[PDB]
Amino acid sequence: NVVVKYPVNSELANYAEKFWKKELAIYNLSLILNKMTPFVKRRSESYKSSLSAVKEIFKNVDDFQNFLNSVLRRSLDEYRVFFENYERLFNSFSSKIFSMRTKSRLVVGLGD
RNA sequence: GAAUGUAGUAUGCGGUCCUUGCGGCUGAGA
């Protein structure tokens, strides 16, 4: 088995533990990713806080992706109204709007 | 040696312009 420890303060430690086990719903992806980092420990006597390490605490990679997308999908309404406002911002200035699909995979901000 | 008063350092002024979080790495070994 594995042991998961959270470097966050008390109370919030238990709440984040409940959040990661899908016991309680999470609506903000940035918050759970950043301020609720799980330190998954493998058979080694260390707590690796890497994305590969935190992948282990799930059933598999597909469960990880589904959980992340479900967390993202909860905020769909607020993001929709925000996108409507942003599009209204575009229409104010005489701007040109075009839409393109990701032909291949895309990753921005890999180096932060 | 004798015999002040009256008075806003104020009026106008965008910490802005130019800068890809990029570079490199076999989900493989039997």
Method used to obtain the model: cryo-EM
Residue A61: strand, helix, or coil: helix
A109 touches strand B (CB under 7 A): yes
What is the experimental resolution, given in Å to one decimal place? 3.0
Residue in the structure block whose two tokens are 């109370």: A11
CA atoms within a 13 Å half-sphere pointing along the CA-CB vector of A85: 6
Strand partners, A35: none
Residues 39-98/A with CB within 7 Å of nucleic chain B are 52
Cα A97 from Cα A112, distance rounded (Å): 29
Nucleotides, chain B, CB distance < 7 Å: 21-23, 27
Cα A53 from Cα A40, distance rounded (Å): 6
